[PDB]
Amino acid sequence: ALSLTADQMVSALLDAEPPILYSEYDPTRPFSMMGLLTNLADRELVHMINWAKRVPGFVDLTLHDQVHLLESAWLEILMIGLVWRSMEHPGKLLFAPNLLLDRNQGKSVEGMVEIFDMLLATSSRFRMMNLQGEEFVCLKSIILLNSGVYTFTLKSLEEKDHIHRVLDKITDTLIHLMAKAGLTLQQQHQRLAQLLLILSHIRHMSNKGMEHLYSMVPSYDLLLEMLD
Amino acid sequence: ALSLTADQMVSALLDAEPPILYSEYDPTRPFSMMGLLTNLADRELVHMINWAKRVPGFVDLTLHDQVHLLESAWLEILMIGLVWRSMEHPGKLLFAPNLLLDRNQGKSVEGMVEIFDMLLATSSRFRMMNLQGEEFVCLKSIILLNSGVYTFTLKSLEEKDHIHRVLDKITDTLIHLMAKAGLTLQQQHQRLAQLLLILSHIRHMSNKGMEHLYSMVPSYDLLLEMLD
Ligand SMILES: CC(C)CN1CCc2cc(O)ccc2[C@H]1c1ccc(/C=C/C(=O)O)cc1
Ligand SMILES: CC(C)CN1CCc2cc(O)ccc2[C@H]1c1ccc(/C=C/C(=O)O)cc1
């Protein structure tokens, strides 16, 4: 994992990409939103576990640490996936190819339109930056490794060190992608910063989303069971 | 602001630094924690407004946008300040020079020890990275400009553009500080990323903190009044 080249890292992440799932509803029947979104999120989680195990360095960690990282990051990962899927659909959120929802549709649940608006704005930011697929997969892997790394013994110190080393490799990779695309050294650092700063907003969105869900979520046990 | 050199940006930010305030309690009297922390935060906010107005580019924005940015960022700014103050005090949070609290003291309020632990871990991360004062002031300014920029008309488009341009200048500045300190180009990008990724955790901490406070906060009107 730490011996991978930038090109190899990118290829590994692109290969690890999960599929785009569909919403489960009878399309011949008349058009609950939260039920549809929950069932979709449930099914995506399984594929996210598989994806996570294919992110270089991730399976080198202890099971306990893998669970902690996924516990911290899962909603951020679903959200960045959603925002990426929605990028070329101004004003809409592509939850699934058969479930493309606008802001007005979000108003059907109390507190939801606020979250829809933040996701739509992130998609807008992605569009304005012209985010590339190779950059997106790097960012999603960064979320997985970074979100829980500040909230964790000699083994723990080794785990955190490894995580930072893998994150450094992904940073190198992002820069390499920007250098290959022809950006100047200045533009490279600037774009790196712009991309990483969006991750703070994705964290914010996830926290707001978790508040919504807790006001009504995969347990440590379910995640542990799925990862073990 | 956009014509400032890296050295000028750093100097401007160092000059803008607010003072370290003291907790208001009778030190001759026997040792409420939340009351002490709230009163401290109240007084710090006033100085934060002054500081914000001295961050290059900030007063170029509309009053409304200044308020929005501060509304989004104020707790993150208090927290990064706290973590910086605490950096050379392992296991303790230096809320003020006369109010140095350990994790055990946080247990006196339900839900607080969790927040103390996250802040202490961030201080630990700062210590391990050997964060420099010049880097800290850059990061605090980045929080101010970035935290609310995704949640905002032709004027709004101009405002967001300006904010991104100022953020790009601060990125250039951070890199310049790392280049002057003798880091390689690789190390520069890596450290930039490490620093910006901590900001995601600071956002997380602020969200957790706001949840605590809302379960019991400066209004738009107070912030507007103070900024106007
Ligand atoms: C209020 C948010 C949590 C709604 N999110 C937005 C992000 C997102 C992305 C997806 O790609 C699929 C669904 C969603 C939904 C969502 C809705 C419900 C749940 C609930 C999960 C559970 O209760 O286990 C999770 C996410
Ligand atoms: C639970 C957290 C919000 C406690 N924080 C931690 C960060 C911090 C940094 C400071 O430098 C000073 C105080 C604090 C406290 C804190 C406590 C109360 C309030 C309340 C403010 C209000 O009610 O206006 C804000 C922050």
Side-chain angles (χ1 to χ4, degrees), chain A residues 1-28 30-91 93-109 111-168 170-179 181-228:
Chain A
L2 297 176
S3 60
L4 269 46
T5 68
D7 289 339
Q8 287 167 0
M9 178 60 74
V10 171
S11 304
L13 297 182
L14 292 169
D15 287 2
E17 276 291 277
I20 296 167
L21 304 181
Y22 280 77
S23 179
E24 265 187 294
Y25 66 89
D26 197 344
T28 65
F31 187 67
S32 105
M33 185 172 294
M34 193 54 40
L36 293 177
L37 297 180
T38 299
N39 180 249
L40 179 61
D42 284 349
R43 284 180 287 118
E44 290 186 276
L45 188 67
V46 191
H47 291 272
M48 189 193 298
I49 296 306
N50 279 358
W51 161 78
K53 296 234 158 221
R54 291 187 59 170
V55 175
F58 187 78
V59 296
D60 298 331
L61 303 172
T62 64
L63 171 62
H64 163 279
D65 287 349
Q66 292 173 41
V67 176
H68 177 80
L69 288 181
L70 271 153
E71 186 174 51
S72 308
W74 70 273
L75 188 56
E76 288 176 275
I77 293 157
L78 290 185
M79 286 179 166
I80 198 178
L82 173 65
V83 172
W84 172 250
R85 291 198 295 283
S86 307
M87 193 178 53
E88 298 174 304
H89 299 101
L93 291 173
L94 199 150
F95 284 97
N98 68 335
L99 192 66
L100 186 66
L101 305 176
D102 65 19
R103 142 178 235 282
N104 289 346
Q105 287 167 299
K107 277 149 50 204
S108 70
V109 176
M112 186 60 44
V113 75
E114 286 84 357
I115 296 171
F116 272 36
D117 284 346
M118 289 187 287
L119 292 159
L120 287 164
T122 313
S123 211
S124 169
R125 181 60 186 161
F126 276 27
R127 201 180 307 112
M128 256 227 61
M129 287 190 72
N130 196 27
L131 184 69
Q132 303 295 294
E134 296 84 359
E135 295 171 318
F136 163 74
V137 298
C138 286
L139 292 177
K140 195 169 51 158
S141 284
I142 285 167
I143 289 169
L144 175 65
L145 294 168
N146 185 68
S147 292
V149 77
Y150 312 103
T151 50
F152 283 133
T153 66
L154 179 51
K155 199 159 70 176
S156 288
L157 296 165
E158 292 168 331
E159 295 271 282
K160 286 182 267 194
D161 179 59
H162 189 242
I163 291 164
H164 117 82
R165 286 185 190 281
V166 179
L167 285 164
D168 286 346
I170 303 175
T171 300
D172 293 344
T173 301
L174 273 168
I175 290 292
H176 184 256
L177 290 167
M178 294 170 199
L183 279 60
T184 66
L185 268 181
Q186 190 181 30
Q187 290 168 329
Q188 289 170 29
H189 308 142
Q190 288 182 357
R191 187 177 180 83
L192 175 63
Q194 291 154 12
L195 291 180
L196 297 183
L197 284 180
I198 299 167
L199 303 191
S200 279
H201 185 63
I202 292 168
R203 182 81 78 124
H204 179 70
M205 289 193 296
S206 173
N207 291 318
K208 298 305 284 200
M210 290 298 281
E211 284 173 38
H212 190 105
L213 298 180
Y214 277 124
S215 73
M216 297 170 67
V217 179
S219 61
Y220 192 95
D221 291 12
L222 176 69
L223 288 173
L224 173 61
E225 170 69 26
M226 299 185 82
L227 280 164
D228 193 12

Side-chain angles (χ1 to χ4, degrees), chain B residues 93-109 111-143:
Chain B
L93 291 173
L94 199 150
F95 284 97
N98 68 335
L99 192 66
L100 186 66
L101 305 176
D102 65 19
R103 142 178 235 282
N104 289 346
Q105 287 167 299
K107 277 149 50 204
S108 70
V109 176
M112 186 60 44
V113 75
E114 286 84 357
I115 296 171
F116 272 36
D117 284 346
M118 289 187 287
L119 292 159
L120 287 164
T122 313
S123 211
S124 169
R125 181 60 186 161
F126 276 27
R127 201 180 307 112
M128 256 227 61
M129 287 190 72
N130 196 27
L131 184 69
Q132 303 295 294
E134 296 84 359
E135 295 171 318
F136 163 74
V137 298
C138 286
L139 292 177
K140 195 169 51 158
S141 284
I142 285 167
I143 289 169

Side-chain angles (χ1 to χ4, degrees), chain B residues 65-91 93-109 111-168 170-179 181-216:
Chain B
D65 287 349
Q66 292 173 41
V67 176
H68 177 80
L69 288 181
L70 271 153
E71 186 174 51
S72 308
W74 70 273
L75 188 56
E76 288 176 275
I77 293 157
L78 290 185
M79 286 179 166
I80 198 178
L82 173 65
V83 172
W84 172 250
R85 291 198 295 283
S86 307
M87 193 178 53
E88 298 174 304
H89 299 101
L93 291 173
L94 199 150
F95 284 97
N98 68 335
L99 192 66
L100 186 66
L101 305 176
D102 65 19
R103 142 178 235 282
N104 289 346
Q105 287 167 299
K107 277 149 50 204
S108 70
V109 176
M112 186 60 44
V113 75
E114 286 84 357
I115 296 171
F116 272 36
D117 284 346
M118 289 187 287
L119 292 159
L120 287 164
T122 313
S123 211
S124 169
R125 181 60 186 161
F126 276 27
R127 201 180 307 112
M128 256 227 61
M129 287 190 72
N130 196 27
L131 184 69
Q132 303 295 294
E134 296 84 359
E135 295 171 318
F136 163 74
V137 298
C138 286
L139 292 177
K140 195 169 51 158
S141 284
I142 285 167
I143 289 169
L144 175 65
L145 294 168
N146 185 68
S147 292
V149 77
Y150 312 103
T151 50
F152 283 133
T153 66
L154 179 51
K155 199 159 70 176
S156 288
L157 296 165
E158 292 168 331
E159 295 271 282
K160 286 182 267 194
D161 179 59
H162 189 242
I163 291 164
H164 117 82
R165 286 185 190 281
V166 179
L167 285 164
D168 286 346
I170 303 175
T171 300
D172 293 344
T173 301
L174 273 168
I175 290 292
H176 184 256
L177 290 167
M178 294 170 199
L183 279 60
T184 66
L185 268 181
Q186 190 181 30
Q187 290 168 329
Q188 289 170 29
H189 308 142
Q190 288 182 357
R191 187 177 180 83
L192 175 63
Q194 291 154 12
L195 291 180
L196 297 183
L197 284 180
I198 299 167
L199 303 191
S200 279
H201 185 63
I202 292 168
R203 182 81 78 124
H204 179 70
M205 289 193 296
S206 173
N207 291 318
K208 298 305 284 200
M210 290 298 281
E211 284 173 38
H212 190 105
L213 298 180
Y214 277 124
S215 73
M216 297 170 67

